Amino acid sequence: SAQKAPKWYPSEDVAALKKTRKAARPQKLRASLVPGTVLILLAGRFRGKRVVYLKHLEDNTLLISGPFKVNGVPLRRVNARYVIATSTKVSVEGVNVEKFNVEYFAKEEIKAERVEDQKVVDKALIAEIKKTPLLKQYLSASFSLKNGDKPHMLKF
Amino acid sequence: VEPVVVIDGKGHLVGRLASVVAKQLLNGQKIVVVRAEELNISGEFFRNKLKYHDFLRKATAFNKTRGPFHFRAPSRIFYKALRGMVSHKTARGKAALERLKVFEGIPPPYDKKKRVVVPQALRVLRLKPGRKYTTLGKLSTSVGWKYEDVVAKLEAKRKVSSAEYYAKKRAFTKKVASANATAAESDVAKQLAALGY
Amino acid sequence: AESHRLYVKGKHLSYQRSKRVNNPNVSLIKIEGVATPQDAQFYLGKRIAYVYRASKEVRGSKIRVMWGKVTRTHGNSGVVRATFRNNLPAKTFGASVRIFLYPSNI
Amino acid sequence: ASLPHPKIVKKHTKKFKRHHSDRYHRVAENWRKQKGIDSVVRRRFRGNISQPKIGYGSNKKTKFLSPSGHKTFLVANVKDLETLTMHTKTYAAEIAHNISAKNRVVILARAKALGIKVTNPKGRLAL
Amino acid sequence: ARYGATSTNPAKSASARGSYLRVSFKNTRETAQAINGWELTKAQKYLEQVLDHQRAIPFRRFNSSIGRTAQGKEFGVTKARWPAKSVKFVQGLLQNAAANAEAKGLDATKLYVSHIQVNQAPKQRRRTYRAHGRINKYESSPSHIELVVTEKEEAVAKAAEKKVVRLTSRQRGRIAAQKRIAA
RNA sequence: UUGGCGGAAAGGCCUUGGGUGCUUGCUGGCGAAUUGCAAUGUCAUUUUGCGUGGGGAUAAAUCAUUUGUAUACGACUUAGA
RNA sequence: GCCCUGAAAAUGGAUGGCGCUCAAGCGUGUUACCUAUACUCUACCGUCAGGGUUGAUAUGAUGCCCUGACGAGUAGGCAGGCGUGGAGGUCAGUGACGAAGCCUAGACCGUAAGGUCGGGUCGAACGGCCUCUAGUGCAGAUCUUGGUGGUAGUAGCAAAUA
RNA sequence: GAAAUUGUUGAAAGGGAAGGGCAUUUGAUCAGACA
């Protein structure tokens, strides 16, 4: 006998988890995030791109669109914490956003059916984009910080 | 904010400018100091000449060649004040000193570049009107610097060349303002003025 | 365009320290353009990344990144305190560092 | 497949070495307390080495646990190994250093059939 | 057998030893290091030139209070000597290794000293008579000398390893876009 | 490519002539997605090595010998196709 | 009140240094800021104290669990443990398919004393546990014996004519 | 066939000592687990 014995063997019965009183409540977005607001994406592949805020999905994320015809940003899902909400406003009360949900973006090249959904949504925005002058060129230009720019006093 | 900052040493105080530069060097900002012969020191000329003589007599007794080195150039006098404001015996303090260049007068290419001043180091902005001050170039010559006339001759030649450059620039700037004034009274000029431009 | 910068440049000054004792767990960062603690309040919680070059090829690139965050202000001149996932090598005193705009509160 | 355990905290990973153990060859590495009247280590001057104390004690829940999550139990034969058949999720069998090469082949064969994890399954193998 | 730490092919090498030789260990170490890595016939002519005071042996480690010479300029030193007794034992061992290589069947025009080692032998003890009726030691410092010669070979190596590299999910997409977009 | 200036560490600056590319000064038409909710997302120059091939160049020093204006030894000063 | 004279010591030197003159000096006031092994909160270790818990079919009642407070220290006292030689009992323990020893900026466990494993070397015995026993743990004693360095290829090997 | 001490080889560092503590970079090396 190299080692005699442990005088008491610990029990291998795993105890159940206690009742967790941490029920989940819906997210409270900041007051600057109203649907129709022009957003600036800070992280990701479309960083610096300017998009249009459409819907607040149930997974605490935001449903956005470029539009895809303007700057090449399709119907996409982004987090609210990586987004600077600007002051430019576009009336989103002509759009069918209620169809899109969390299960819509399921991984399971580009699937064909979502292409026409992008074309049926962008037509309802480019109609009003042409109302305010220079908005279409604004939405196709990437945001960037220049020398001397101070974000703590820059009005967005 | 800039890759290399060129500070004009004329009208500055050797101690208040060195403390500004020493902090900038430790933060990783390259500093070039020009015209170190026109630095100012508070107090009369006889005060600073006596203070340097007190420093001059401090040397190692058994070997003068390994004691305190009393540099006479105005650039090195400013360097000595700056060296004691930095922990120069450590690796971090040595790397900070390689980010600094101090010259008498305005040397080459730093003569074709913009020179700045440190507002909290100007003699005119810190000293009471009436206080006596000493010029570093005159003090250095009295303690053994023999290049005051060479720098003054080269500086006079540089100012002639820079005056000719400014005449071309001032004439070109007036031509630019005439075209910018004609750019007014238009649609794009009035729209810019509405947006603060 | 000519510039694609979505961050603000900062400088690693030193660790949180007393006269003779330092704490490497907290680093002091000087953000350019900031000179008051009130302006430094905007940068609280913003993500900090230090970009440096290495020699050995790791994942098809010679650039390794050390991440951190702004925790609180420090002093009356806009200096902020920073805690990284791993402490800075202390050889970067005066090296440039990047402070991003996310997580954004605007 | 160990039991669920909390995160293992050591509070000290460096070895406690004697004062001047790197200064003299005659001073061993096994820790000895300084009894000197003028010792800077005994008086706890800052910048010196740290002395072991009861504050460095590991958590009782995670004490004696390997990084895999089991407790090391020395095993010399099959009968010693058969004391852990009902305790495979808490103890891991370790073969003694003096076990012959042919006797270990039986040990790994028996441990595999019982689901007992062996911490040193490569010792003295004719690979 | 069982020489020092070598890192050469034994099938293309020849060796020789000398044990308990009554030569200075400090002088022999300097002589051995002077021909380390040298070609065999090149080192034999150099050792013979030491006896004629035409070239010197650079003293590098055991050189305290050694007089200067102009012949150390070749080796970049100022302190060198001519250990004639050390050279004869070293050159007497080089011709033995050269004879062993001929017996094995190696080419003498490619041999070079790939390994040479000198370490202390058991000391031979004598005694000295000092002032006030005191006796001190007069010990010798003998040497164990071993050296290996090796044939020089070309075509060193190639095709080392594979260098496994890990990739992320998002970064590979734009690398696939490096050819999708550009060339 | 033309011409001029610049020696304080010039090694930079100004300028002529055409060639070519871009132009968001203005009006358009297509392309971006799947890198799937953030992971610097690589974009510097530094030296050295190694091969392709477009030009150029075709030496010395040291030891040894010798000298004594030198010299403890090195060094120094000389000489010798 | 401040400043100056009074006010002279021997290596070169000390508001800590640089330096500072509407001070970065002095007197005084208002705030902001820097952080000690101090305070507050939380986790863990140990100690102490107060309690809960022998129901049967499970393993430790010197056990498990709950709660609170506390933690400096020489001379010194006490307690709990680690290690060594030998002895009784036990593991029908390990081993020539390699015991003991030794080497190993290789690994694991313990706050630590130490224990364990892998690899190399090695060749014949050795270990865990429950108890007993002692010629039982070293860095020092101008310690003892033995061995080896720096100094060092150094001092030197120059009387007695060659 | 240990240590002091020494040689060779390999690696690293070195501007009037060296060695140590806390923290991280870099290099080397090791580990863990695939419902």
mmCIF file of C-alpha atoms in Angstrom, chain A residues 61-154:
data_model
loop_
_atom_site.group_PDB
_atom_site.id
_atom_site.type_symbol
_atom_site.label_atom_id
_atom_site.label_comp_id
_atom_site.label_asym_id
_atom_site.label_seq_id
_atom_site.Cartn_x
_atom_site.Cartn_y
_atom_site.Cartn_z
ATOM 1 C CA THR A 61 -30.386 44.558 -30.538
ATOM 2 C CA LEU A 62 -31.324 47.083 -33.225
ATOM 3 C CA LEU A 63 -32.599 46.425 -36.747
ATOM 4 C CA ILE A 64 -30.848 48.770 -39.184
ATOM 5 C CA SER A 65 -30.605 49.429 -42.907
ATOM 6 C CA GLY A 66 -28.182 51.494 -44.960
ATOM 7 C CA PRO A 67 -30.159 51.580 -47.281
ATOM 8 C CA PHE A 68 -28.275 48.924 -49.247
ATOM 9 C CA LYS A 69 -28.649 50.902 -52.482
ATOM 10 C CA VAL A 70 -27.054 53.991 -50.899
ATOM 11 C CA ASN A 71 -23.976 52.763 -49.007
ATOM 12 C CA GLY A 72 -24.105 48.967 -49.293
ATOM 13 C CA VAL A 73 -25.340 48.169 -45.771
ATOM 14 C CA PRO A 74 -28.218 45.645 -46.022
ATOM 15 C CA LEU A 75 -30.880 44.784 -43.448
ATOM 16 C CA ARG A 76 -28.617 43.933 -40.521
ATOM 17 C CA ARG A 77 -28.629 43.482 -36.750
ATOM 18 C CA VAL A 78 -26.297 45.501 -34.505
ATOM 19 C CA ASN A 79 -25.872 46.169 -30.799
ATOM 20 C CA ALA A 80 -27.061 49.460 -29.324
ATOM 21 C CA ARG A 81 -23.845 50.034 -27.340
ATOM 22 C CA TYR A 82 -21.657 50.219 -30.484
ATOM 23 C CA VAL A 83 -23.836 52.908 -32.091
ATOM 24 C CA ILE A 84 -23.810 56.710 -31.864
ATOM 25 C CA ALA A 85 -27.303 58.103 -32.438
ATOM 26 C CA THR A 86 -27.273 61.341 -34.437
ATOM 27 C CA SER A 87 -29.898 64.100 -34.634
ATOM 28 C CA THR A 88 -30.991 63.594 -38.256
ATOM 29 C CA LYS A 89 -34.505 62.144 -38.367
ATOM 30 C CA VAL A 90 -36.372 60.283 -41.114
ATOM 31 C CA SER A 91 -40.031 59.281 -40.741
ATOM 32 C CA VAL A 92 -40.060 55.473 -40.611
ATOM 33 C CA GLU A 93 -43.864 55.333 -40.571
ATOM 34 C CA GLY A 94 -44.121 53.774 -44.030
ATOM 35 C CA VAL A 95 -42.139 50.598 -43.444
ATOM 36 C CA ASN A 96 -43.076 46.941 -42.818
ATOM 37 C CA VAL A 97 -40.462 46.218 -40.103
ATOM 38 C CA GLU A 98 -42.837 44.029 -38.066
ATOM 39 C CA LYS A 99 -42.135 41.035 -40.322
ATOM 40 C CA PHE A 100 -38.462 40.905 -39.314
ATOM 41 C CA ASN A 101 -37.680 39.301 -35.953
ATOM 42 C CA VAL A 102 -34.941 37.456 -34.052
ATOM 43 C CA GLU A 103 -35.583 34.115 -35.773
ATOM 44 C CA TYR A 104 -35.377 35.862 -39.163
ATOM 45 C CA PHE A 105 -31.568 36.038 -38.844
ATOM 46 C CA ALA A 106 -30.846 32.313 -38.590
ATOM 47 C CA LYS A 107 -27.552 30.883 -39.836
ATOM 48 C CA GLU A 108 -28.859 27.340 -40.508
ATOM 49 C CA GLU A 109 -23.632 32.138 -50.146
ATOM 50 C CA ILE A 110 -26.327 34.796 -49.577
ATOM 51 C CA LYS A 111 -29.829 33.324 -49.465
ATOM 52 C CA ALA A 112 -32.001 34.489 -52.347
ATOM 53 C CA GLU A 113 -35.238 35.322 -50.516
ATOM 54 C CA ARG A 114 -33.737 38.034 -48.284
ATOM 55 C CA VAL A 115 -32.556 39.964 -51.368
ATOM 56 C CA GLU A 116 -36.065 41.069 -52.358
ATOM 57 C CA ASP A 117 -36.880 41.945 -48.742
ATOM 58 C CA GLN A 118 -34.005 44.435 -48.951
ATOM 59 C CA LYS A 119 -35.446 45.894 -52.160
ATOM 60 C CA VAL A 120 -38.979 46.160 -50.746
ATOM 61 C CA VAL A 121 -37.805 48.081 -47.653
ATOM 62 C CA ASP A 122 -35.299 50.493 -49.228
ATOM 63 C CA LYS A 123 -37.895 51.898 -51.651
ATOM 64 C CA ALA A 124 -39.899 53.142 -48.648
ATOM 65 C CA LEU A 125 -36.858 55.105 -47.382
ATOM 66 C CA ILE A 126 -35.251 56.471 -50.566
ATOM 67 C CA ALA A 127 -38.584 58.151 -51.336
ATOM 68 C CA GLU A 128 -38.208 60.335 -48.232
ATOM 69 C CA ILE A 129 -34.400 60.544 -48.438
ATOM 70 C CA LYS A 130 -34.836 62.541 -51.663
ATOM 71 C CA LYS A 131 -37.039 65.044 -49.788
ATOM 72 C CA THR A 132 -34.293 66.551 -47.626
ATOM 73 C CA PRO A 133 -31.404 67.735 -49.842
ATOM 74 C CA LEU A 134 -27.932 66.169 -49.564
ATOM 75 C CA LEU A 135 -29.146 63.326 -47.321
ATOM 76 C CA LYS A 136 -28.411 60.595 -49.884
ATOM 77 C CA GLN A 137 -24.806 61.748 -50.294
ATOM 78 C CA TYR A 138 -24.578 62.080 -46.504
ATOM 79 C CA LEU A 139 -25.694 58.467 -46.009
ATOM 80 C CA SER A 140 -23.076 57.233 -48.512
ATOM 81 C CA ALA A 141 -20.145 58.955 -46.760
ATOM 82 C CA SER A 142 -18.224 57.263 -43.957
ATOM 83 C CA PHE A 143 -17.889 59.041 -40.621
ATOM 84 C CA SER A 144 -14.377 59.663 -39.325
ATOM 85 C CA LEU A 145 -12.556 61.752 -36.736
ATOM 86 C CA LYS A 146 -10.155 64.425 -37.977
ATOM 87 C CA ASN A 147 -7.305 66.272 -36.299
ATOM 88 C CA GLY A 148 -8.577 68.470 -33.480
ATOM 89 C CA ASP A 149 -11.988 66.792 -33.241
ATOM 90 C CA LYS A 150 -13.102 66.319 -29.625
ATOM 91 C CA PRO A 151 -15.954 63.790 -29.232
ATOM 92 C CA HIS A 152 -16.863 65.023 -25.735
ATOM 93 C CA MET A 153 -18.121 68.298 -27.255
ATOM 94 C CA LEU A 154 -19.101 67.133 -30.765
#
